[PDB]
Design an enzyme around this catalytic site. Structure first.
Site, PDB file in Angstrom:
ATOM      1  N   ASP A  36     -78.685 -12.002  36.693  1.00  0.00           N
ATOM      2  CA  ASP A  36     -78.463 -10.886  37.540  1.00  0.00           C
ATOM      3  C   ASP A  36     -77.064 -10.293  37.539  1.00  0.00           C
ATOM      4  O   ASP A  36     -76.049 -11.065  37.435  1.00  0.00           O
ATOM      5  CB  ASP A  36     -78.885 -11.385  39.141  1.00  0.00           C
ATOM      6  CG  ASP A  36     -78.149 -12.502  39.648  1.00  0.00           C
ATOM      7  OD1 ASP A  36     -77.892 -13.394  38.858  1.00  0.00           O
ATOM      8  OD2 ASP A  36     -77.834 -12.479  40.916  1.00  0.00           O
ATOM      9  N   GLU A  73     -77.948 -15.335  41.435  1.00  0.00           N
ATOM     10  CA  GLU A  73     -76.491 -16.080  41.813  1.00  0.00           C
ATOM     11  C   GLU A  73     -75.885 -15.006  42.627  1.00  0.00           C
ATOM     12  O   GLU A  73     -75.189 -15.589  43.709  1.00  0.00           O
ATOM     13  CB  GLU A  73     -75.684 -16.369  40.703  1.00  0.00           C
ATOM     14  CG  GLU A  73     -74.497 -17.184  41.068  1.00  0.00           C
ATOM     15  CD  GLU A  73     -73.038 -16.222  41.484  1.00  0.00           C
ATOM     16  OE1 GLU A  73     -73.067 -15.135  41.302  1.00  0.00           O
ATOM     17  OE2 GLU A  73     -72.114 -16.706  42.145  1.00  0.00           O
TER      18      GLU A  73
HETATM   19 ZN   LIG Z   1     -71.004 -14.075  38.400  1.00  0.00          ZN
END
Ligand SMILES: [Zn+2]
Ligand SMILES: [Cl-]
Ligand SMILES: [Cl-]
Ligand SMILES: [Cl-]
Ligand SMILES: [Cl-]
Ligand SMILES: [Cl-]
Ligand SMILES: [Cl-]
Ligand SMILES: [Cl-]
Ligand SMILES: [Cl-]
Ligand SMILES: [Cl-]
Ligand SMILES: [Cl-]
Ligand SMILES: [Cl-]
Ligand SMILES: [Cl-]
Ligand SMILES: [Cl-]
Ligand SMILES: [Cl-]
Ligand SMILES: [Cl-]
Ligand code: NA
Ligand code: NA
Ligand code: NA
Ligand SMILES: [Zn+2]
Lengths: 374, 377
Positions: free
Chosen positions: A67, A132
């Site tokens: 991501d 994350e």
């Molecule tokens: Zn990162």
């Protein structure tokens, strides 16, 4: 042929806004399956993750996230954020630095390592999440819960988060602070300034508590951490009228805390201070991460040696900045270190990464694999 | 019963006019016709959206009656038993917006003038009225501008009876002989905004201000006096931050208000606050606003006449208090006048089903008339 740059460009064009993988893991799983990795997908809600491994025994895992954070106003970027472009040796695009360059370098390192050591005596693993950057309730934390529930062996984890300041490998992160937020509401009695004896101003009642809170020294840090830092991020009371005595005061304070303190120690000290000042309060705590530290060991030695091999000078071993999914993986008892590219442009417009630095990082990652897994 | 009940009749006529501040809705035209009929000279003084008048009869030692034709919004017409602009008598009570604040007082003081002039046609003093259509809202173009005009021409004004509803249970149980000042500090404490990961690059103004706020809230300003409670400091508002738990704020806003007695000047309050800011080595910007100065009429001919009139009709002496409700008294006090407030029960003011006791309005008119006879006959 520039396999690290080519794979980074393929990842950047996929607009993997957390928690959407946008096909990044399908690309990485294809590459890892082609060199003999077993892949277990671990999808939770809208988050995609995988745990991949090759070999048996002493385990080195590379960790990272597919991501990226949103680009902002795309029309203000010099080149479209999801159209990777090389100009003057820099690769531009959202996630070039955080952290699709690192993902490409660790996959190509694995391909070159498995070619050199087809019967490596250790185990090489990947732990990859599509969340994350955002809430991260369904990413690495859930993979680690699953791996610990099956007594998975994981001795060493290299987190590919961009650790570097000016050149790749000048800095590696060997630990990270915890983050604990206190959302505190001090209760009084709302009223009118014409009749203060009928009200109880919570701002007035809180003032001695706030004065003592901001003066506290929470710890003195240690060899690897500065002192735990308490900051009041937000404070609010009143309706915007100058004739109302407010009924409530809201204070939000954050702790970026060292391994010298646990969340329960900080919470007890705060509750004790509220009790000493005899406040009426409601509190909501947020624990967004626990501190971790890898002071020494085979992983630190391997990372320092791989970096030194090219740079000569040892990386600084720092605990600066925010945190990473290392905080979850550290729960497994693993040694955890972070090595990645320059972080100057992460989460900003015109994010970019030095293309030669990605190529160098891939060589450093391969050296870490050879030292620990061959 | 309009032919034998002139106070109630004029009250209900006024209530019917939806004089939401600052529209007079024609109320002053009714008062002006009644005063002109008994030999008053009227000087309309209109400023923008607001209507006012100064009216006088006779010459020399001057007693003014002050009040306002405007009313606060009725609110939720469904929660009213009778429509707020449809005056109704139920159980000796006159219901309607303005019945208590303060169209009853206006009717009482106009009828008192008619009776007074009938009894004392060649009265030796001057009787005056100072009426505004905006006491309840901004009040930028109301009584304050009339007073500025009167002071600019050295107008004489010795005594002022403000007809704001002063009473708790029975008309005249409380008279207001003063009010507190109001002073507000809009304080900004300047810091340097940053990120909690890098706190040495920031300067949190909440942290810098905490010792200052702790000391500010502990200061004792005065102990008040015979007529005032202690000067009161309240922090009404405080704000800092962006809403994110990872940002160190760059600016802190604090707003504190003082309700202060005649024992302290605004100058002294500001000095003590600046001394505290400088003591705490803060970077700041202050914006002060004085909404009003305190005033006190502790004694004299007006207090005696009001106390005597209330006692004559109630045989109990009013309490002389300095808190509760609002008035334009502070503006008229700038002229050096003695200023006292006497009016109906204030329980229902600014509420649904606002009402006033009809017999209490009749009694108030007689009290007003006795005050006129004592001071300007
Ligand atoms: Zn990162
Ligand atoms: Cl390459
Ligand atoms: Cl999700
Ligand atoms: Cl190798
Ligand atoms: Cl081999
Ligand atoms: Cl409030
Ligand atoms: Cl954690
Ligand atoms: Cl009547
Ligand atoms: Cl006239
Ligand atoms: Cl008379
Ligand atoms: Cl006469
Ligand atoms: Cl720090
Ligand atoms: Cl600070
Ligand atoms: Cl700010
Ligand atoms: Cl004033
Ligand atoms: Cl006198
Ligand atoms: Na093995
Ligand atoms: Na005279
Ligand atoms: Na007192
Ligand atoms: Zn009023």
């Amino acid at each position: 042929s520039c396999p690290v740059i080519e794979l980074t460009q393929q990842l950047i064009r996929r607009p993997s806004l957390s928690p959407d993988d946008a096909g990044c893991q399908a690309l990485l799983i294809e590459r890892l399956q082609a060199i003999g990795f077993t892949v277990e997908r671990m999808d939770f809600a809208d988050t995609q993750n995988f745990w991949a491994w090759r070999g048996q025994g002493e385990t080195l895992a590379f960790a990272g996230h597919t991501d990226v954070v949103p680009p902002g106003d795309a029309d203000r970027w010099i080149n479209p954020p999801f159209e990777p472009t090389i100009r003057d040796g820099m690769l531009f695009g959202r996630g070039a630095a955080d952290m699709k360059g690192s993902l490409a370098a660790m996959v190509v390192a694995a391909e070159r390592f498995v070619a050199q050591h087809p019967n490596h005596t250790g185990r090489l693993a990947f732990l990859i999440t599509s969340d994350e950057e955002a809430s991260a309730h369904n990413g690495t934390v859930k993979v680690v819960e699953a791996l610990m529930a099956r007594n998975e062996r994981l001795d060493y984890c290299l987190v590919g988060e961009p650790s570097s300041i000016e050149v790749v490998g000048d800095v590696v992160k060997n630990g990270r602070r915890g983050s604990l937020t206190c959302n505190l509401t001090i209760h009084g009695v709302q009223g009118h300034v014409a009749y203060p004896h009928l009200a109880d101003n919570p701002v007035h009642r809180a003032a001695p508590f706030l004065n003592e809170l901001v003066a506290i020294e929470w710890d003195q840090g240690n060899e690897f951490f500065p002192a735990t830092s308490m900051q009041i991020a937000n404070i609010q009371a009143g309706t915007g009228s100058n004739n109302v005595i407010p009924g409530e005061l809201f204070v939000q304070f954050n702790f970026r805390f060292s391994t010298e303190l646990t969340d329960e120690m900080i919470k007890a000290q705060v509750l004790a201070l509220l009790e000493k000042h005899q406040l009426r309060y409601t509190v909501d705590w947020w624990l967004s991460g626990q501190p971790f530290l890898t002071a020494r060991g085979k992983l630190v030695d391997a990372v320092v040696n791989a970096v030194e091999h090219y740079n000569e000078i040892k990386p600084q071993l720092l605990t600066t900045g925010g945190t990473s999914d290392g905080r979850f993986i550290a729960r497994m008892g693993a040694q955890v270190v972070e090595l990645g590219p320059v972080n100057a442009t992460i989460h900003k417009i015109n994010e970019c990464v030095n293309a030669a630095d990605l190529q160098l990082l891939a060589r450093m990652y391969q050296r870490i694999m050879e030292q620990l897994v061959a």
